[PDB]
Chains A and B, each alone.
Chain A
Amino acid sequence: MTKPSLISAKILQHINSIVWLQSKGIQEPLKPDVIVNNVAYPPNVIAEKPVTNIEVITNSSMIENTGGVRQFLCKAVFEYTIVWVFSREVYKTYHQIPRSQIQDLLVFCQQFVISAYQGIDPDITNIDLKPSQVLVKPTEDVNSDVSNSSSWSVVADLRFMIEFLTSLDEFLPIDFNKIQPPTWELLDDLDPIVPEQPFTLNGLIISLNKSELPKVRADESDTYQLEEILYIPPTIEDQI
């Protein structure tokens, strides 16, 4: 269904049991190493990137015409960036930083997000992985030790290509509450085109014709006689 519920489930699966995310924001942390259980751990942040490549193809075999409202299959790329900052005070050389454990944590998150098909949204039809990039670039302006040497920053991206089912009926003015008012005015004094409304069958009228002897024709009015006009629920009489 809707991408905000899906993205909330995606970040929940991300931080579920794999990555510990101390803060969420676009900024390398300048906090000291975090002390928990008398053990020091590096600062980290997560940047949730805006959803891109939002495309609706209507051209997949996994779209069922249920006959109520037209369904769609939507493709999206959901991009998350996790950054860990390793201070140079404790990590003197590049090779002693725990890059291996970061890669292990990254592959574990990839496996957990891929396996959780039924746990992210029921309407997910495909989840695929783009090749992840791991960078050991320096921090933005974060210095640790004497001489003002830049701290080690380990940056890992996760880009999930995900295909899921949607319908028109899933979107309501409640999810647009802080961006768009319901029932606004048209920008050029035009009328809004109202979509179709689900039609309810609250009466049926049948008018049958008794055709002439050779065969039914149904075009000329003298070749058939009106027999009766039938209202399938008797209560439709005198109502419409």
Chain B
Amino acid sequence: LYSNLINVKQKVISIREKLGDPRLKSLVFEYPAGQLFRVTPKLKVSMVPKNMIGLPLDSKSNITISADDYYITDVSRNVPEAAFRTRAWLDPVINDSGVIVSGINCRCHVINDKSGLSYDLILRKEREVRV
């Protein structure tokens, strides 16, 4: 069916969090304009190693940076597609208010959507991060 398949995939994946593994990271998005959208499972993510590159703002400049990216493997399709056009945060903290203080700032760099029941995406860290 592909409709209940994504939801059952979320239910079966929710077993992974009951086992304490350190690869699990909390991902949040800001899909609506002002407030946040959180992925339900505390999914796992790997880190592709860094590469030393020029600035993406101006490539032919003295300022250079290291591009750091994260590889998120099992992320449900139930999340809105337009969420991927908005900045994402890995391990964020929410206060008493609706804002976030600390976390690791990332932007969706490349989408892999070959599997029909889950997305898989790589997201690049911002050049300036909070923590």
Contact = CB atoms under 8 A, between A and B. Distances in A.
Interface of A: 25-28, 30, 32, 47, 49-50, 52, 79, 81, 83, 140-144, 146, 148, 155, 157
Contact of B57 (A50, A79, A155): A155
Nearest to A50: B62
Given A144-B85, A148-B84, A148-B85, A28 B56 contact: yes
22 contacts: A25-B127, A26-B55, A26-B65, A26-B128, A27-B57, A27-B128, A32-B33, A47-B58, A47-B63, A49-B62, A49-B63, A50-B63, A79-B61, A81-B61, A83-B57, A140-B56, A144-B85, A148-B84, A148-B85, A148-B111, A155-B57, A155-B58
Q: Is the interface of B mostly helix, strand, loop or mixed?
A: loop
Contacts of B86: 30
Contacts of A25: 127-128
B111 to A, nearest CB: 7
B25 interface: no
Given A50-B63, A143-B108, 17 more contacts: A25-B127, A27-B128, A30-B86, A30-B87, A47-B58, A47-B63, A49-B63, A79-B61, A81-B57, A140-B57, A141-B107, A141-B109, A142-B85, A148-B84, A148-B85, A148-B111, A157-B58
Nearest to A89: B85
Interface of B: 33, 55-58, 61-63, 65, 82, 84-87, 107-109, 111, 124, 126-128
Between A26, A49, A83, the greatest number of chain B beta carbons within 10 A of the residue's beta carbon is seen for A26
